[PDB]
């Protein structure tokens, strides 16, 4: 079946997500305001959004079974390289397929393609990003598959600079095996057909989005007027040496 250990992994991951994902979006009132009326008018608001999301990704990662047993160095490597990908994953939960937007509970916090461009990004990122969100939504993942996918994304042994790639892979494979068993046990046809392979392809697509995001970010953040609008945490996690 799903073993007791596998069912325990899922319960831990679900609780971690529930503890780090507020589906009421209460905290958003404290972000710098959306400005839509370029100069990059959404940059302050989306910087605070992302900075908040990084704090939640860290809290989630901390609870992935095994993650605590990696060295500090490997933990930092994994979080820095995956943060943007997990934020893209976790955003899918507010994503609405119909109008290609992220609905975070408020007319002001319904984000669209123009909003993202007003943080300095171009359609070279934004269009593939929308296509990702759409394709991911159409997988109709259960919450268990969603949180397993985020955990797998974080614990990737191929990330630049990982030292104990053996231990990372062992932790990842434990999570992948949990996922595959969950799909075999619980996910109904036809949605279950090649589902694991589709999910793995989404992780590949995320590396592409990560690369394009990082290029665009490196460029925009090189302008001091933009950099000044970013939070110290964003600057550290998307930047540092």
């Amino acid at each position: 079946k799903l073993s007791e250990e596998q069912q325990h992994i899922i319960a831990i991951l679900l609780d971690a997500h529930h503890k780090t994902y507020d589906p009421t979006y209460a905290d958003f009132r404290d972000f710098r305001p959306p400005v839509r009326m370029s100069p990059l008018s959404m940059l302050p608001h989306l910087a605070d959004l992302v900075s908040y999301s990084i704090q939640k990704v860290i809290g989630f990662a901390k609870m992935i079974p095994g993650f605590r047993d990696l060295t500090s160095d490997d933990q930092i490597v994994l979080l820095k390289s995956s943060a943007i990908e997990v934020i893209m994953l976790r955003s899918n939960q507010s994503f609405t397929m119909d109008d290609m937007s992220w609905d975070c509970g408020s007319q002001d916090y319904k984000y669209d393609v123009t909003d993202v461009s007003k943080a300095g990004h171009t359609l070279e990122l934004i269009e593939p990003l929308i296509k990702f969100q759409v394709g991911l939504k159409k997988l109709n993942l259960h919450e268990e598959e969603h949180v397993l996918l985020m955990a797998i994304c974080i614990v990737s042994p191929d990330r630049p600079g990982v030292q104990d790639a053996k231990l990372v892979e062992a932790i990842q494979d434990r999570l992948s095996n949990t996922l595959q068993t969950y799909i075999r046990c619980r996910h109904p046809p036809p949605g279950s057909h090649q589902l694991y392979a589709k999910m793995i392809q989404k992780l590949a697509d995320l590396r592409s989005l990560n690369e394009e995001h990082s290029k665009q970010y490196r460029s925009l953040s090189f302008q001091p007027e933009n950099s000044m609008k970013l939070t110290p945490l964003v600057l550290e996690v998307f930047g540092n040496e």
Binding site: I58, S72, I76, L79, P232, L233
Partner: peptide, 9 residues
């Protein structure tokens, strides 16, 4: 920095 300090333990 902040990541390292949050992960410390």
């Amino acid at each position: 920095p902040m990541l390292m300090n949050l992960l410390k333990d």
